[PDB]
């Protein structure tokens, strides 16, 4: 019964805890307060997904770099634009585990890029994290049909 927004936000926080200073961008603090996040970033389910998503990022390293750079340098309304990417992945055929993980990994990679670049304006980090979290709510129906995030990792991946 953890929502996709909770699990993505926990993954992003964990990813921050293990990159650079291990410090959290103010935006991730805000998102935790407002969601509100009830899942620990050190929860085993989060550590396990974090490894799967890092594997997907590494395997598709350049494609993730390129797609994110094209996205962020072309958008005029960052949060809205996350929604467009989301719908084109998940309403173009049935959702699948792979597509769900590909999306989550892309989001976590975007958040990592934004938070590691000290020059990134606050508003770009803020609207991107809000955008990814809001768009990701669209996975809740399908993942519930799979018994939730915890079932999928423990039993299917």
């Amino acid at each position: 019964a953890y929502s996709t927004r909770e699990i993505l936000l926990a993954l992003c926080i964990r990813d921050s805890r293990v990159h650079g200073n291990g410090t959290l961008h103010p935006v991730l603090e805000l998102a935790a307060r407002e969601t509100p996040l009830r899942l620990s970033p050190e929860d085993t389910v989060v550590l396990r997904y974090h490894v799967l998503l890092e594997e997907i990022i590494e395997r598709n390293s350049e494609t993730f770099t390129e797609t994110w750079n094209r996205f962020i340098t072309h958008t005029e309304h960052v949060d809205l634009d996350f929604n467009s990417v989301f719908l084109e992945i998940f309403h173009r055929g049935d959702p699948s585990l792979g597509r769900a993980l590909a999306w989550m990994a892309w989001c976590m990679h975007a958040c990592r890029t934004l938070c590691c670049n000290q020059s990134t304006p606050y508003y770009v980090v803020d609207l991107s994290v809000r955008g990814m979290l809001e768009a990701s709510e669209g996975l809740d129906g399908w993942i519930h049909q799979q018994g939730g995030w915890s079932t999928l990792i423990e039993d299917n991946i």
Partner: peptide, 22 residues
């Protein structure tokens, strides 16, 4: 204008489908 976002989704659908055999 919305062209970057359609390419991005093409790539992630592809990546997700590759994973489905993984």
């Amino acid at each position: 204008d919305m062209r970057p976002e359609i390419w991005i989704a093409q790539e992630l659908r592809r990546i997700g489908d590759e994973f489905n055999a993984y």
